[PDB]
């Protein structure tokens, strides 16, 4: 279906929590729990951060990241930026139609 | 300790179907899903589709029509087929798990594995 | 023996000693006054009796009753792990029930102010009914049971029944039953009532699921000395016809003979849980397998045990076959499937028939020269000699025992949501509100205590088993706790079936 | 030689009214497949088996085994007017010789509120066993339905009708009467 | 001791049978456990695809009638068992000749699985058996076992079994071995045929009784040019679904092979078939093999080829002629009756009810007894001899061994009960 919408970009100086959104119709975001984040590098392969809206991976994935759901909107949290921080970020859901679909991603940039 | 490497192509022609597989290594096919999923440059990720290991299948509906997959379990890889490739196809091409628990009727929406990525050019 | 004497302490905690385990569960119930002490005839007419099917007539009473019937009354999720891992089949034997702390509340509204005081010589009527006359609807799986979780206060469920009908109209031979027929006992708030009960003989349930299957049985290495026909023509043409016959082995396996078939089959519908996979129609109620009994329709709900997939297809389910839990704070219409937990009871495969398949062929007529052999599709199967099968897994969430209809005859009466089938299982237990109306009602404490009887395992396997486990995972909530606002949640349906046994 | 006591009673209730019209269920049924009145519109919905639906609820037993029969009129005009007393009755076949179902397995007699029908085969002479239609199924009727194929976005699904079916686990009956 | 016997050969029946013979055991799969499926045989197909292994130990197998006898109802009451006079022999292959000698200090083990531990493939029909003559000298054979597969591959439920893990009897060639087994209680099999039929115990009479369930088969006519012209072996017979995997009914439910009269008629996949002495393997002539007939259960049972009867497909009415249609399959009603499958001196004697919550008359379908606790299985191995290990150490296990086989004798002594 229709592509989860994310802003463009996000910037903050290192040491201070940022919040990314991801909106969603309420058939994606909306009527499930399924929320994902990734992050990704430049030149090489995403990295799953959130799963189940707020669950962190095992391991790999610091506290620092927090996910959190209200409405049509999901949210990435995160807290004390560090310069490996900065990284692309998409949202990606599971839709009514039975599919996947991600965000546009949002750039983050460390001051 | 599951790795993904997957193989293929750099550059295609327009018009004509492309074929990438993917080789899990250090683990096993198993009972996962297997998705695949492409990043044009300088462009958000899009999941193209997985596959099962008993050949079950779901593909993004915008690329459904020209989509095929199959997974092979002797030879322990997965593959993709894409027809009439034209400039829009030019991606990096992942193959990522996604994870999925037997048994119960979760849907399977994440990817928690990742190749390293194959990067394909459509042109003449 | 007094109004400020405790009658009972509280008890919460499970016993392991070796092959049987003693739980011990103990909660704060409340009692309303139920119809204004008054009898009053139900029917669906009363609320508009819409279908056929859906047509009853009975009566509610103003008595409620204590639902013990579900796991995890009994079962904390840490003893039903540390039960499942470990054990080959379980069973109850003992029950000790008990009643005290009766507590009554009289209620006094004046204008928008409600006041609430004791009344100190008010009583409450309870009795349990050990002769089975009346009655008995704790094995249709009902909610008002026992909290899960021991700090919640529950409130006791309406007692009412149904008898004949026709529409909505009783009929003749329809029974009426007074419950204040019943000798009872009467308590004060320093009374207490307590009974024990035996469970009857049951089988052990099978907790384990078998690690073989029921066509793979043979010696691989082996021929078998029976033949089998493998050729019916020599060639490619006129008159080929021929009588050949190859012996059944190793190589080919689906031809060899066998001393034992699958249990039986009533084929389902399957669903698949990939919405898009699904026919774009309305065949929740068309499409079901039911049976019709006096002329009205019935959904095939559970139904015989069989498996819910077949191998490699997680996704489908039979449209009634499964058992279909809500998750906490789950809505009752219309809910979404992310929020229901659907059971799966693909661990039967190896001697059961998959649901949403037929059971096989059979020969439809006489093959002649002129005439090919034709197969039809055997849609439903009952009992042939030879076959075994498997009962349906019990849950944490689910239903213990039932009550075996009292009849001429029934067929292996365990019943068919899951658990104990017994011709006398544990007895209702009636109470209501003694009169006075003054608005009135009571609170106080149930302990339920039962012995359960333990199979172990001696299994040789060498490689590790199953196993239920918590994952080791980051999240917000724990699994079975409480969240930030105090409400307690069963987060999956929790089966019996992790050990594994020969065939 | 020691048997059971022959069954002399009529239950008051039926196999599929045992439950508490009260209370709810806590089991879930699917009601609902399509968001309705569109293309592709595919959904899964489930509701709380209730009193108000008492036809979908969750049962721990289910009807006894039956083979069907033909019907007949006691008014001549009801019935077709051809001869098909041997030709429509119901038999079973042994060693290629065609022997009438008589009586056959106990099945109830008619649905309630039908007097005037009776099996061509199935009752004494003329007998009725009303009194086990509460557990037995009628003699004149399909058992039930069964799914006959797997549906798909392609397929419609289907079901077919069950003239006779064998003992199943969960099967109580009540036997003839004397 | 070396030059003493440890058994004296016993060969009469008395009723209590008496068998003795001669065997020979080799080392199986060079002292190892090897995984096996169909891929590791060429890979099959769906209904073929199995996982599983294969053991070094062997396994006796006297579930042959024609084992325990030379050419109204009986069944088995004690068992007795015994082995002895083994002897381990070597065998050097050099050049031109091999050559056998005696290995005096080497054993054997042997042990049975009396709490059904293992998986039973006692009960599936195998070759192996004693012979029926009391002369010839039988190889042991092989023990394995089959898995859960999703293919040919296996899944987490599979399980594997190590028979090391058994104690076990170690037998030098002076030792010898013996056990006793009780047989449960299990009904006669019925060695008679009905006078009567149960109809004529006159076709719209009423009945008290009616025959027993049915599964119908394809018919085959022993006269070749009766048949059709087309192959119909397997895509004409009856079969049952598993899992996804569908198995042929064979022999399946007791039924007639043949109505009165006619003879020349075999249920397709429901009988048993035999072979006569030196038949090959593979697409041998009708003569080359023995079909057996049911015909004897006719009273009783309907005919495997025949449909079961008819039923009403409708309601009549004043608009609408009676329908009737025919029933390919029936289970049980009550009041059904009906004859178990007859036993052969060729064919089985019992098998293992499989463990499972429920089971419905769980006499065998291919004949014979049909036990919970049947005989155990007895489980035999060479143990290995490692040849000359290296003069340094080295962890790996070692994979060269002494070239060497067992002989012996063995004893059975089944008691029956007559009727």
């Keep these: 279906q229709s592509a989860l919408t994310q802003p463009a970009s996000v910037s903050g100086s290192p040491g201070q929590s940022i919040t990314i959104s991801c909106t969603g119709t309420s058939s994606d975001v909306g009527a499930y729990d399924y929320v994902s984040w990734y992050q990704q590098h430049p030149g090489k392969a995403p990295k799953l951060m959130i799963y189940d809206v707020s669950n962190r991976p095992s391991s790999g994935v610091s506290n620092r990241f927090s996910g959190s759901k209200s409405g049509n909107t999901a949210s990435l949290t995160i807290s004390g930026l560090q310069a490996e921080d900065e990284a692309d970020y998409y949202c990606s859901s599971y839709t009514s139609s039975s599919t996947v679909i991600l965000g546009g991603g949002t750039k983050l940039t460390v001051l | ?124 | 023996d007094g109004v400020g004497s405790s009658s009972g302490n509280w008890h919460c905690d499970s016993q392991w000693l070796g092959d049987r385990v003693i739980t011990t569960s103990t909660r704060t119930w409340a009692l309303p006054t139920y119809n204004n002490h008054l009898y009053k005839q139900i029917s669906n007419s009363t609320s508009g009796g819409s279908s056929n099917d859906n047509a009853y007539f009975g009566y509610s009473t103003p008595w409620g009753y204590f639902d013990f019937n579900r796991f995890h009354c009994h079962f904390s999720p840490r003893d039903w792990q540390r039960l499942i891992n470990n054990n080959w089949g379980f069973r109850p034997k003992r029950l000790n029930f008990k009643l005290f702390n009766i507590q009554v509340k009289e209620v006094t509204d004046n204008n928008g102010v409600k006041t609430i005081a004791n009344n100190l010589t008010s009583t409450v009527q309870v009795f349990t009914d050990s002769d089975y006359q009346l009655p008995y609807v704790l094995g249709s799986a009902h909610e008002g049971c026992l909290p899960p979780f021991p700090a919640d206060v529950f409130m006791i469920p309406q007692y009412g029944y149904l008898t004949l009908n026709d529409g909505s109209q009783a009929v003749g031979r329809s029974s009426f039953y007074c419950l204040e027929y019943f000798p009872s006992q009467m308590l004060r708030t320093g009374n207490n009532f307590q009974f024990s009960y035996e469970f009857e003989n049951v089988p052990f349930h099978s907790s384990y699921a078998h690690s073989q299957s029921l066509d793979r049985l043979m010696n691989p290495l082996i021929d078998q000395y029976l033949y089998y026909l493998s050729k019916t023509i020599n060639g490619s043409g006129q008159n080929q016809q021929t009588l050949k016959f190859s012996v059944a082995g190793p190589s080919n396996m689906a031809v060899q003979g066998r001393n034992y078939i699958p249990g039986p089959s009533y084929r389902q519908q399957r669903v698949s849980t990939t919405v898009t996979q699904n026919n774009n129609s309305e065949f929740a109620w068309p499409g079901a397998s039911s049976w019709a009994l006096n002329g009205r329709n019935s959904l095939m709900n559970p139904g015989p045990a069989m498996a819910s997939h077949k191998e490699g297809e997680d996704r489908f389910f039979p449209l009634s076959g499964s058992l279909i839990f809500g998750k906490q704070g789950t809505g009752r219409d219309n809910v979404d499937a992310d929020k229901v937990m659907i059971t799966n009871e693909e661990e039967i495969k190896t001697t059961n028939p998959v649901a949403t398949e037929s059971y096989g062929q059979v020969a439809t007529n006489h093959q002649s020269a002129q005439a090919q052999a034709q197969t039809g599709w055997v849609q439903n199967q009952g009992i042939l000699p030879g076959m075994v099968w498997q009962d349906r897994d019990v849950y944490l969430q689910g239903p213990i025992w039932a009550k075996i209809p009292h009849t001429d005859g029934n067929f292996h009466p365990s019943p068919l949501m899951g658990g104990f089938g017994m011709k006398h299982p544990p007895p209702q237990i009636l109470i209501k509100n003694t009169p006075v109306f003054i608005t009135q009602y009571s609170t106080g404490q149930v302990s339920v205590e039962i012995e359960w009887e333990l199979q172990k395992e001696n299994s040789k396997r060498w490689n590790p088993e199953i196993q239920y486990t918590s994952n080791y995972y980051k999240s917000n909530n724990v699994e079975f706790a409480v969240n930030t606002e105090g409400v307690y949640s069963e987060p999956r349906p929790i089966g019996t079936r992790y050990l594994t046994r020969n065939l």
């Excluded at chain 2, 490739?85 to 399977?108: E, F, I, K, L, N």
């Design chain 2, 1 to 124: 300790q599951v790795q993904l490497q997957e193989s293929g192509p750099g550059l295609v022609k327009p018009s004509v179907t492309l074929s990438l597989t993917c080789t899990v290594s250090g683990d096993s096919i198993s009972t996962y899903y297997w998705s695949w999923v492409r990043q044009p440059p300088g462009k958000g990720l899009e999941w193209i589709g997985y596959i099962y290991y008993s050949g079950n299948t779901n593909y993004n509906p915008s690329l459904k029509s020209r989509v095929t997959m199959s997974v092979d379990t002797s030879k322990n890889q997965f593959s993709l087929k894409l027809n009439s490739v034209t400039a829009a196809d030019t991606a990096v091409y992942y193959c990522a798990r996604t994870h999925h628990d037997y048994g119960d009727y979760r849907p399977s929406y994440y990817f928690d594995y990742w190749g390293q990525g194959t990067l394909v050019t459509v042109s003449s």
